[PDB]
């Protein structure tokens, strides 16, 4: 951001001179990286099975690619070294936008309260928090938070103002986050190639002592691949330079 | 204000004498002061850029001027020395119209309690508190203050009877104030000249080794300037002399 | 306007100026007259420096 100043009147004294200042811009990249698997199987097993095994292998491999994308983007697990944007949980922690959930009785740090405290930090960065990522644990746990008399504290939907998405492909790392809160206008996923299947019947897998020549072993395989990119729109806002658009509710380790 | 008395009629005892008394006035001033910036850029960069750089520079410069005005008026940060009126937060503190927030469980000094106590101080001064200034933190924090059982106090209806204005240009100093409550009839902003833009293309910026001759370097610049004034109507109300029309909720630095 | 310690850059000091200019010449027609060559057409009363 540029910077104005209060200025005097003088033809001679330095306080009479209007300050110079600059706006500046920076560059964020989507870089497409490849995620893939090969699943080999005997051609005799494909012939004897009563169900289309290769259709199940294609669907299971598609789900395994979907898991590996969420792991990279949300938690930074196995993230490609060319993705210069920090993953959502590491970004929130490094920015100081992390709050620890306190379990037990209803509390200003219960699942509703700790999420409100995180959205407050994202709002004070000048971003608009609008999206909550979580495991299903949060959905069942909010439904059973008790006040000090033991009645339900949150008998009705209390995450209003968040679009809520539940991770169900097992990518969630519950030791890293209870939930992730973001301004979803500042997170983009680049889809360079959606998931594709190729049937292999002559290909060679591995090398040396691990070499599998598919044709002479009477085998086939599926190759599953996709290309994805991620960018986090960390930028200046009206509040200041270098503002992170994401925060995290961490678990808490005792009490 | 003048002061009356009771007279016990007598030609000779001092209780028979009507007391003489006095009314007085004072002068409050609007003094216009100048805030400005110059933003120089190469004319080739204006031509090669894919966006109107001079338009974004004008709007970013306008925002940066707006931040200096809010900093001066609310908090006294870089307040021009010719403005004799105290800034809204220093005024409220010096008048003894500051209430410390007490964070944690809902209590008579929580955010709603402290705002009520401040407004009743302004009302007992004989002013009509009608305006609340704060950052977005206040809106998130009243939405999560808990009763002693841990339930949400204040589901709805907080801060009715105030026009509420939220500061988003980064001028707010959360270490100085949680919120400012004022009678907005007694605060005036003088606009001697609104945000005014000149395009410079022959001008010289700086002197000696710092000198940028714009024309022989193929550069241009925007000059943005405005003149603003501020006055606070500290004056007698029906309750007494020299009453301040402003109170402040100060942050909790002790719980 | 000016240079170094005297330099006023009008734009960054929020100033303006007027430049006023004119161009003039003068000639005295010292010439011959019927009396002779090189005759000056002007005389002066100079002030009393002695009383």
Coordinates of C-alpha atoms in Angstrom, one line a residue, chain A residues 30-175:
Chain A
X30 CA -0.6 -22.1 -10.2
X31 CA 1.9 -24.9 -11.2
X32 CA 0.4 -28.2 -12.4
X33 CA 1.9 -31.3 -10.9
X34 CA 1.1 -35.0 -11.6
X35 CA -0.4 -37.5 -9.2
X36 CA -0.6 -41.1 -10.4
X37 CA -0.7 -44.9 -9.6
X38 CA -0.3 -48.2 -11.5
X39 CA -2.3 -51.2 -10.4
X40 CA -1.1 -54.5 -12.0
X41 CA -3.2 -57.8 -11.9
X42 CA -3.0 -61.3 -13.6
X43 CA -4.9 -61.7 -16.8
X44 CA -6.2 -65.1 -15.6
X45 CA -7.7 -63.3 -12.5
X46 CA -9.4 -60.8 -14.7
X47 CA -10.8 -63.7 -16.8
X48 CA -12.0 -65.8 -13.8
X49 CA -13.7 -63.1 -11.7
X50 CA -17.5 -62.7 -11.9
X51 CA -17.4 -58.9 -11.5
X52 CA -15.4 -56.3 -13.6
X53 CA -12.3 -56.0 -11.3
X54 CA -10.8 -53.4 -13.6
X55 CA -13.9 -51.1 -13.1
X56 CA -13.5 -51.4 -9.3
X57 CA -9.7 -50.8 -9.6
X58 CA -10.4 -47.7 -11.7
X59 CA -12.9 -46.3 -9.1
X60 CA -10.6 -47.1 -6.1
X61 CA -7.6 -45.5 -7.8
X62 CA -9.7 -42.4 -8.6
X63 CA -10.5 -42.1 -4.8
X64 CA -6.8 -42.6 -3.9
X65 CA -5.9 -39.7 -6.2
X66 CA -8.6 -37.6 -4.6
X67 CA -7.2 -38.4 -1.1
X68 CA -3.6 -37.4 -2.2
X69 CA -4.8 -34.0 -3.5
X70 CA -6.6 -33.1 -0.2
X71 CA -3.5 -34.3 1.8
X72 CA -1.3 -31.9 -0.2
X73 CA -3.6 -28.9 -0.2
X74 CA -5.1 -28.9 3.3
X75 CA -2.2 -30.4 5.4
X76 CA 1.0 -30.0 3.1
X77 CA 1.5 -33.8 3.3
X78 CA 3.7 -34.9 0.3
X79 CA 3.1 -31.5 -1.3
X80 CA 5.0 -30.9 -4.6
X81 CA 8.1 -28.7 -4.1
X82 CA 7.0 -26.4 -7.1
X83 CA 3.8 -25.4 -5.2
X84 CA 5.2 -22.3 -3.5
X85 CA 1.9 -21.5 -1.7
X86 CA 1.8 -22.9 1.8
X87 CA -0.8 -25.5 2.4
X88 CA -3.9 -24.3 4.4
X89 CA -3.0 -25.6 7.9
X90 CA 0.7 -24.6 7.7
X91 CA -0.3 -21.2 6.3
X92 CA -2.8 -20.6 9.2
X93 CA -0.2 -21.7 11.8
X94 CA 2.7 -19.6 10.4
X95 CA 0.4 -16.5 10.2
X96 CA -0.6 -16.9 13.9
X97 CA -4.3 -17.6 12.9
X98 CA -4.4 -20.8 14.9
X99 CA -6.7 -21.3 18.0
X100 CA -6.8 -24.4 20.2
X101 CA -10.2 -26.1 20.8
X102 CA -11.0 -26.7 24.5
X103 CA -13.2 -29.9 24.9
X104 CA -15.8 -30.6 27.7
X105 CA -18.5 -28.1 28.9
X106 CA -19.6 -25.3 26.5
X107 CA -16.9 -22.7 26.4
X108 CA -15.7 -19.6 24.5
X109 CA -13.2 -22.2 23.0
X110 CA -15.7 -25.0 22.3
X111 CA -16.1 -26.1 18.6
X112 CA -18.4 -23.1 17.9
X113 CA -16.4 -20.7 20.0
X114 CA -12.9 -21.6 18.7
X115 CA -14.3 -21.4 15.2
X116 CA -15.7 -17.9 15.9
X117 CA -12.3 -16.8 17.3
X118 CA -10.6 -18.1 14.1
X119 CA -13.1 -16.3 11.8
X120 CA -12.5 -13.1 13.8
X121 CA -8.7 -13.3 13.0
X122 CA -9.4 -13.9 9.3
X123 CA -11.8 -10.9 9.3
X124 CA -9.2 -8.7 11.1
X125 CA -6.8 -9.6 8.3
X126 CA -9.3 -7.9 5.9
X127 CA -10.5 -11.2 4.3
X128 CA -14.1 -12.7 4.5
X129 CA -14.1 -16.2 6.1
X130 CA -16.9 -18.2 4.4
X131 CA -15.8 -21.8 4.3
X132 CA -15.2 -24.5 7.0
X133 CA -13.4 -27.8 6.2
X134 CA -13.6 -30.6 8.9
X135 CA -13.8 -34.3 9.5
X136 CA -17.3 -35.6 10.5
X137 CA -16.2 -35.6 14.1
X138 CA -17.1 -31.9 14.4
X139 CA -20.7 -32.6 13.2
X140 CA -21.4 -35.2 15.8
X141 CA -19.4 -33.3 18.5
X142 CA -21.4 -30.0 18.2
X143 CA -24.6 -32.0 18.5
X144 CA -23.4 -33.2 22.0
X145 CA -21.6 -30.2 23.6
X146 CA -23.2 -29.7 27.0
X147 CA -23.6 -26.6 29.2
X148 CA -22.9 -26.8 33.0
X149 CA -26.4 -28.2 33.7
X150 CA -25.9 -30.9 31.1
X151 CA -28.5 -29.8 28.5
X152 CA -27.4 -29.5 24.8
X153 CA -25.6 -26.2 24.3
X154 CA -26.2 -26.1 20.5
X155 CA -29.6 -27.8 19.7
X156 CA -29.7 -26.0 16.2
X157 CA -27.3 -25.2 13.3
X158 CA -24.6 -22.8 14.7
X159 CA -22.0 -22.7 11.8
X160 CA -24.1 -20.3 9.8
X161 CA -22.0 -18.0 7.6
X162 CA -19.7 -21.0 6.8
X163 CA -20.3 -23.3 3.8
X164 CA -19.3 -26.5 5.6
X165 CA -17.5 -29.4 3.8
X166 CA -16.7 -32.7 5.5
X167 CA -13.6 -34.7 4.5
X168 CA -14.7 -38.4 4.0
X169 CA -11.9 -39.8 1.8
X170 CA -9.6 -40.3 4.9
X171 CA -7.2 -37.3 4.0
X172 CA -8.0 -35.6 7.3
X173 CA -5.2 -35.5 9.9
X174 CA -7.1 -35.0 13.2
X175 CA -3.8 -34.3 15.2

